[PDB]
């Protein structure tokens, strides 16, 4: 979890904060159903 | 008709949105503020020394901000 | 900038006022300077040149 | 209506303020007049317009018939005046002190100093300490009323500036506000 500054330029992109948070929610649910 | 005539002396400059209102300085020629100089507006053409009639002397216009 | 550093501090042959005592003292003392016999102070340390009070007789380098 | 049921009681300034007359208040009962604050200006009491900024609050406490006699709640300088004094590239030095007078009148006074330019903090500490000790002294030697008047004319501020010259010149020294906390 070492975020690339390049990804923060909103050109052709969604705001990086929210993509990070989405990945985190996905992480949550996956680790949950694993155990 | 409680009016008060006053004498124009100096013209401050065209005022209002469209410049059709002209700002002048007028001296109250009669009333409770005799001789007092007030900045007052004029719709329609005006010159120096016109006698303009006031309903209220107390009203005043803000200084023209450039 | 001077190539060889030369000290801005000289030494002072001085005469004390009270007991007539000669002494060699420093221009920028880091501490107090007092006389041998009467004991009174001679030069006060400060941020720079010490505060002389007695009479300077000669300037040594 | 009620307003006809009111009657006017005259107020009287404190005796040490020359016992001047200032104004009247309408009350439906005398009991509603006690502990009534009145805000006056020293130009009114002494007539001196030069010190118009200073204001005195009098808590009205004594009613004999129609007449009202008061106590000296406190003093405040005019906020506009203080604002005018304060300027950029200048220091503001505020000294707050509780104090007992010679006659047991307990008090809070805070005092004001401003210099021409920006000064070192330690010098401000020295200013505070010197003014502190001076006001302690004047409290010791002087009683309530005389000390109050002595503060009113500001000559305390004058001697304060005189002694504070020995640390840094002052654009103006003064006593911003005074609150008689309680009586003996």
């Amino acid at each position: 979890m070492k975020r690339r500054p390049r990804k923060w330029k909103k050109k052709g992109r969604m705001r990086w904060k929210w993509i990070k948070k989405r990945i985190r929610r996905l992480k949550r649910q996956r680790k949950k159903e694993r155990g | 008709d409680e009016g008060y005539p006053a004498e124009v002396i100096e013209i401050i400059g065209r005022t209002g949105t469209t410049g059709d209102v002209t700002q002048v300085k007028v001296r109250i020629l009669e009333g409770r503020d005799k001789g007092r100089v007030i900045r007052r507006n004029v719709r329609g053409p005006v010159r120096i020394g016109d006698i303009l009639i006031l309903r209220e002397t107390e009203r005043e216009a803000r200084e023209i901000k450039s | 900038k001077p190539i060889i550093p030369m000290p801005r501090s000289r030494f002072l042959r001085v005469k004390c006022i009270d007991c007539g005592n000669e002494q060699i003292v420093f221009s920028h003392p880091a501490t107090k300077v007092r006389c041998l016999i009467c004991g009174a102070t001679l030069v006060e340390p400060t941020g720079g040149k010490g505060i002389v009070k007695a009479k300077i007789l000669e300037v040594l380098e | 209506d009620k307003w006809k049921l009111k009657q006017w009681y005259i107020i009287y300034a404190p005796d040490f303020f020359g016992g001047v007359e200032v104004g009247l208040t309408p009350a439906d009962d005398p009991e509603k007049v006690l502990n009534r604050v009145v805000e006056v200006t020293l130009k009114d009491v002494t007539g001196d317009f030069t010190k118009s900024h200073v204001k005195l609050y009098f808590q009205v406490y004594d009613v004999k018939g129609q007449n009202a006699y008061t106590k000296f709640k406190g003093m405040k300088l005019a906020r506009s005046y203080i604002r005018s004094l304060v300027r950029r590239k200048t220091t503001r030095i505020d000294g707050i002190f509780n104090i007992t007078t010679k006659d047991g009148y307990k008090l809070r006074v805070m005092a004001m100093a401003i210099a021409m330019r920006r000064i070192q903090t330690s010098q401000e500490r020295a200013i505070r300490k010197i003014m502190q000790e001076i006001i302690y002294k004047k409290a010791e030697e002087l009683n309530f009323k005389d000390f109050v008047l002595e503060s009113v004319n500001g000559k305390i501020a004058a001697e304060i500036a005189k002694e504070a010259k020995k640390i840094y010149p002052l654009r103006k020294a003064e006593i911003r506000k005074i609150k008689v906390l309680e009586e003996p």
């Binding site: - | 209220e56 107390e58 | - | 009111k6 007359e21 104004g23 009247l24 208040t25 009145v38």
Partner: protein, 127 residues
């Protein structure tokens, strides 16, 4: 003896209130808001509602033995705005013009040294 009262002229950007009280400010004499004189809430802070209401309160005070008045201008103060509304000047002129002898005209907006966090959130009232 000439009678002097206190005219508290509160002015926000939504309303103006003119309250006339005795020299101690402990007894009410005349208290007229902007709402008394207009029928649109938007019109309450306008200078006309101000001067009309002010004149009404002024004549009422005159009828009750008042002649002189000390004006006390007030902005909302606190964490709220500090500039008096546009109607305060109009109301002061009206009180002068209603036959009241005007004395001290000062501001009494309570200015805080260090006040609560104001309203609206961190990014401001995002109009």
């Amino acid at each position: 003896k000439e009678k002097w009262g206190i005219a508290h002229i509160y002015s926000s950007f939504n309303n103006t209130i003119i309250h006339i009280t005795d020299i101690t400010g402990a007894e009410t004499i005349s208290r007229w808001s902007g709402g008394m004189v207009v029928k649109a809430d938007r019109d309450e802070p306008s200078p006309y509602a101000a001067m009309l209401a002010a004149r009404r309160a002024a004549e009422e005070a005159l009828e009750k033995g008042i002649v002189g008045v000390h004006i006390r201008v007030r902005a909302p103060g606190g964490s709220k705005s500090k500039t008096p509304g546009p109607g305060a000047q109009a109301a002061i002129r009206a009180l002068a013009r209603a036959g009241l002898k005007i004395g001290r005209v000062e501001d009494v907006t309570p200015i805080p040294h260090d006040g609560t966090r104001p309203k609206g959130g961190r990014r401001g009232r995002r109009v």
